[PDB]
Amino acid sequence: SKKTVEFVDYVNPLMGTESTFAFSHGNTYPAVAVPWGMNFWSPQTGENGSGWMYTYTDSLMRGFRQTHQPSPWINDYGTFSIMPLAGELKMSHKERLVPFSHQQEKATPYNYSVTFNNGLQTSLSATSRGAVFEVSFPEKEDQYVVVDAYNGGSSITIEPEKRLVKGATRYNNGGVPDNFANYFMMEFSHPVIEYGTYNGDTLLHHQTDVAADYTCAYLKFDVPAGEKLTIRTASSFISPEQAAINFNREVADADVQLISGKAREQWNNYLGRVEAEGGTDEQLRTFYSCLYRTLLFPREFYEFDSQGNPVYYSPYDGNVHDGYMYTDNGFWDTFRAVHPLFTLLYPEVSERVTQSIINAYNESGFMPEWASPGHRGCMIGNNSVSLLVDAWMKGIQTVDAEKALEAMIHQTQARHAEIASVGRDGFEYYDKLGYVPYPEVPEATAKTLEYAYADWCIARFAESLGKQDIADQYYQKAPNYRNLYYPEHGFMWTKDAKGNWRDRFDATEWGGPFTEGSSWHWTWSVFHDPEGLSELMGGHEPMIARLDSMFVAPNTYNYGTYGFVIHEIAEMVALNMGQYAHGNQPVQHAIYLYDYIGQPWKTQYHLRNVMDKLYNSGSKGYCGDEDNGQTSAWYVFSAMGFYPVCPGMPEYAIGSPLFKKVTLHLPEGKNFVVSAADNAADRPYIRKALLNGQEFTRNYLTHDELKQGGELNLSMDSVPNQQRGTQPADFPYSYSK
Amino acid sequence: WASPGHRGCMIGNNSVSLLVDAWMKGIQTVDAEKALEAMIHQTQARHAEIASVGRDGFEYYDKLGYVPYPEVPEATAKTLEYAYADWCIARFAESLGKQDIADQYYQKAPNYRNLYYPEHGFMWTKDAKGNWRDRFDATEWGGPFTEGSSWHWTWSVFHDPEGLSELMGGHEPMIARLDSMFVAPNTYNYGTYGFVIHEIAEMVALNMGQYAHGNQPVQHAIYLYDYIGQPWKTQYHLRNVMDKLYNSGSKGYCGDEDNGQTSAWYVFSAMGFYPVCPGMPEYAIGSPLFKKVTLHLPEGKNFVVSAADNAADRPYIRKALLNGQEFTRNYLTHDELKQGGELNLSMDSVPNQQRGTQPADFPYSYSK
Ligand code: NA
Ligand code: NA
Description:
Oligomer: part of a larger assembly
Strand content of chain A: 15-25%
Structural class of chain A: alpha+beta
Bound molecules: sodium ion
Largest interface: A-B, 30 and 25 residues
């Protein structure tokens, strides 16, 4: 039903725009899009070529980009920009610098609007594959639009009499076939009075066709006072003909108001699949902003042909195929919570994503791990397997079982000749030794830990097909994490190919056999077997103590006499020293581990503390020094009250919900409610629970329990209930249990 | 190091810098041939007992392009100091018309590149066989470094900021790394309960020591934004440092005064400009502390830096006139000062991101 404040109204696309470390994979741009849209749009302040496309502290705008960028370091491909200008014409991105104030900027998912200091106003709204702009030019100043087709070998053609511009952009950062291009077209509402092209060296007036390394074109207008210029645009990865089909289907005849309303409706539809009630405006903004961020990637990479059928340009083999393709995703990051969120609330997406993984395998020989748009060398692991198996175990079964199994096994028994992250780096050593050795293989221990998990997923998959021999082969590798636990030191470490432990153990030392972390983080990377990890650590007791040594309260000695303001200044210190590296991948699940070892109240306390202290909805809203936006799905799940600790096992460990109520609108008209009528900032603890009206003491919900609809009714309290959730029957899955 | 005669202390051949910086500014009171002989000898010889007199490890340096560790103590710091002295000698020889000698020394000016560890993005160390020392650690003091770690010493390339940015991946990455050194502290959501809790938080960041003010190899670092397109950041951060890291009381400095050096940084920075690279007669512009400074130079010439609307929260240069003409360069030459005149600055509470961002505006780099 219509509401005064709709879910999309809570979204701030600039949340955490100042929260990201320069040398991380976190994006900072206010994406204008529809969910999973093939093309995104954004303001651009950075130079062409810079992954730092939009920098909040920069006050000069250069263009509005059609972008696909999933990380500043992965960078962009198939990108061009459009830039309206008043007064003086400037062609090169190096010279198009127009001052604006954030006070005259309004960024939302369905429309970005900005008014420059010179009074020129523009806004744009996106469809899946196109966009529409309005431009209001200042009176009595020259009126231009510049189209920038980027460098790397581009072309632009102007047809002034038809008010059309078409072109091809080929800029990319690798991972593309030899015939790669994005074919674009745009239409202007008003007569093109003058026009010209630029080839990176010379501005050529009256010329209408240009091709060079770097190309731009300008159009000059004479829009009458009171009127606005509309620009309609769409692109395709298939051909100029398909770009025109996309244009005609999605943006032809539209003004920005039409596209804006449609995108707003789409966002409200998709965001509204989880309805949060009974929270502050700040909490609602944080939640829906994180959810918006979560519904952007991976992007759909398919298009609908003249017959309305889905087709795609393959970024793996460069041919056009029937069916579905997605891209722009690092599974090493997104298997943990983003794809699990899809399997629950957006399973129609997982249905197509899983098919696309197999398609990429058919087209290239390997499943992707980091793709943008094709195979890119980045990060580690075989988490492609997790997406397939997690979905399969939740009843999302669109791929052929035998083909999927073959692909999974191959991913663990081969590696790309050039790209270490494609397939399994070090598989020969791992199969022989039970671990990947360092310094023989970079990041060996983090790899071993990721591989033991992927092998557990493959065992689970094979077992569910009745292929018990293959399952037992893979279950034999599931405990390989144990092979790197250094008993004298009580942490994961590394060995060379001869079995010698690396000299001078140091739990805090980054790099080497570890990835983006140290043993302090990577020791927790055993989410398929928390019970087996506790065994290594000497039992539930020692494990609880080590978790406690990550989330411990600040020490204020006798200084708290100055007030409660003392414990706040004191809490900063632990976070700044980084005892808990919120966002660090191998410990994203760690707060939930208390659910497995008998003290769920600690999960409840710490989770609620993190949600309150490390998030807000503003420009620095991903507060964790180690959080560069990657915890968006983590926040959505955690606010709802539960989290997929081990994808591939259809279970969600229970934390503590943020709102008085969330309602999940699931397939086939089923609704699942988590109600917490007496929830409050100082009432993080679950005293009692009813599941569908029956006393409920388990520390997890199954996917089936959610999917069938119903209600988890929680009685929240300010003190923990130490008699609840402490029995072995209450604990979620472990391989060794 | 002299007190009163030769004393074994510290490193480098910066005697050469005193001679060359003065010479290139027109101070020429020594025999040119004798000075060149002495400079060359300083790089080709070492005192039998005192490591800091002459060039410790010169044999290795000339052969390998760097001083190796553990063969020579403090090898990486020495290499970086030597690359700069060699650049100075090249400048001197060139000005005398000795182009061959100049070219031989200019070939050594880029030796700083030989210790940049690409995998890690910091200066590090190699042994004589060319093997990187195991267990890289950017914050590890001692060994191949002195009075600092790679974190500090990575910035010790005053004769070639452009070439340093090249190693780092360009202007933007170098900006990003400077920004992290000078970043204001993270206050999470604690900003609500109190304030300036941000001020208190700043003191913690300084206790931690992200930017080691006074630490020699990074003294110039705040001025580097002048070389890479964002002078407004130099302006903001310099003024912050001058306000927060100095006072006139008994605990007035953040570290050793050092024979006028920490003191001289403050004097230059308060006047509005700083000699990033002695031996090159120019001064990178920062942001003046006062509404006016007048320098009384030789031959009755006076140079004025005026900033009539200067104030504590107006650290930025909106606009400048040099001797009445629009001025956008991020440096003044020694000749511009010496001849007398005025740099008239319009100060502002917000940065002017359109000013001083062009290649023509950047000061000297050997690589440019
Ligand atoms: Na952050
Ligand atoms: Na705004």
